[PDB]
Design a protein around this ligand. Structure first.
Ligand SMILES: NC(=O)c1ccc[n+]([C@@H]2O[C@H](COP(=O)([O-])OP(=O)(O)OC[C@H]3O[C@@H](n4cnc5c(N)ncnc54)[C@H](OP(=O)(O)O)[C@@H]3O)[C@@H](O)[C@H]2O)c1
Ligand SMILES: O=C(O)COc1cc(F)ccc1C(=O)NCc1cccc(C(=O)O)c1
Length: 316
């Protein structure tokens, strides 16, 4: 297991990164410092997470301490839905750069294919509770992302939560200049994504798996929901390998040639989650884990099911 995967822009991306959604602003600076200290070189960020300034403090301190060089880090962020208008994309990227205290991002993703009305609110609502869409086409948003590469603000661009027809729409865009480097999608043993992964990989697009532990801290968790970390079948595979269940859940996507971005603000877990380059799941283990698929999503963007670009009506 090599530590990085080659992207279609010629850069190498670390296959294991630190997630930062829900990481409290008072804890995420230390989390990122610890992560870098214990070997992480890839941090997954987003403007909508509201903690990029604090993530940036950690990155900057480790650069200043010369724990790492900038060229060794792979920093990812995402364009929020209220900034899909072509005239807002650069400013959104620049705000993220300012907060992260960087002069470029390694990868910048369209966070969702759905554009929303611009404004202060991340989920602008009509008086009846529906999210108010933007009329900006995702192909036009893509062209705006391409400009960021050409202006030196980002080294690579990609997409997130795009279904295969939406990926196809970009790949078939008239005058396409840069293909997406990455599609970041939810993926774990309860949402195994065989079809979409195969499609993306066949096109040279690297897939990043989010919520690989099943996001137990997701705000809308219900007591009766399935729980990967507590699944006795996964615990058994972990026990066989003398690893934790979380370590198996992280190793699983790695062996599918995916990038994976487990989130933690707990120093012991941050270190645990990185210690996954010292064992191998068998083919049988892999197929067994795949067999647990139930098409269960942490992130279904339920407020946007009527949006013309809602991604999860299609089978994949
Ligand atoms: N593109 C998108 O739309 C999108 C959507 C969702 C997520 N993401 C990205 O993917 C990242 C990961 O997904 P996620 O945050 O939803 O959930 P996750 O990484 O599947 O799970 C995070 C949860 O697991 C706990 N945890 C971490 N390591 C553990 C371990 N070794 N043992 C036991 N529990 C452990 C964390 O607790 P503590 O933090 O308290 O240690 C936290 O409650 C996000 O942070 C974000 O960067 C992107
Ligand atoms: O994008 C990710 O990583 C994970 O999803 C988010 C992250 C955020 F920081 C902020 C909102 C979301 C998100 O999609 N919420 C969905 C939601 C549910 C209930 C009521 C309002 C919004």
């Amino acid at each position: 297991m090599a530590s990085r995967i080659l992207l279609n822009n010629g850069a190498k991306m670390p296959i294991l990164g630190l997630g930062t959604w829900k990481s409290p602003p008072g804890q995420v600076t230390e989390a990122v410092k610890v992560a870098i200290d214990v070997g992480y070189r890839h941090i997954d960020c987003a403007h909508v997470y509201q903690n990029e300034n604090e993530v940036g403090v950690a990155i900057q301190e480790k650069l200043r301490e010369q724990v790492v060089k900038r060229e060794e880090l792979f920093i990812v962020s995402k364009l929020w839905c209220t900034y899909h208008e072509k005239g807002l994309v650069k400013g959104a990227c620049q705000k993220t750069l300012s907060d992260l205290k960087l002069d470029y991002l390694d990868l910048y993703l369209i966070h969702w294919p759905t554009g929303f009305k611009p404004g202060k609110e991340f989920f602008p609502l009509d008086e009846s509770g529906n999210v108010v869409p933007s009329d900006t086409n995702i192909l036009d948003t893509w062209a705006a992302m391409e400009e960021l590469v050409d202006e030196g603000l980002v080294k690579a661009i990609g997409i997130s939560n795009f279904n295969h027809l939406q990926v196809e729409m970009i790949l078939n865009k008239p005058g396409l200049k840069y293909k997406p480097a990455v599609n970041q999608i939810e993926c774990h043993p309860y949402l195994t994504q065989e079809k979409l992964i195969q499609y993306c990989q066949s096109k040279g697009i690297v897939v990043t798996a989010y919520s690989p532990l099943g996001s137990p801290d997701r705000p809308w968790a219900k007591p009766e929901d399935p729980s990967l970390l507590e699944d006795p079948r996964i615990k058994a595979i972990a026990a066989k390998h003398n690893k934790t269940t979380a370590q198996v859940l992280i190793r699983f996507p790695m062996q599918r040639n995916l990038v994976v971005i487990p989130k933690s603000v707990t120093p012991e877990r941050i270190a645990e989650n990185f210690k996954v380059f010292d064992f191998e799941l068998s083919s049988q283990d892999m197929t067994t884990l795949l067999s647990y698929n139930r098409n269960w999503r942490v992130c279904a963007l339920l407020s946007c099911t009527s949006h013309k670009d809602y991604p999860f009506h299609e089978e994949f």
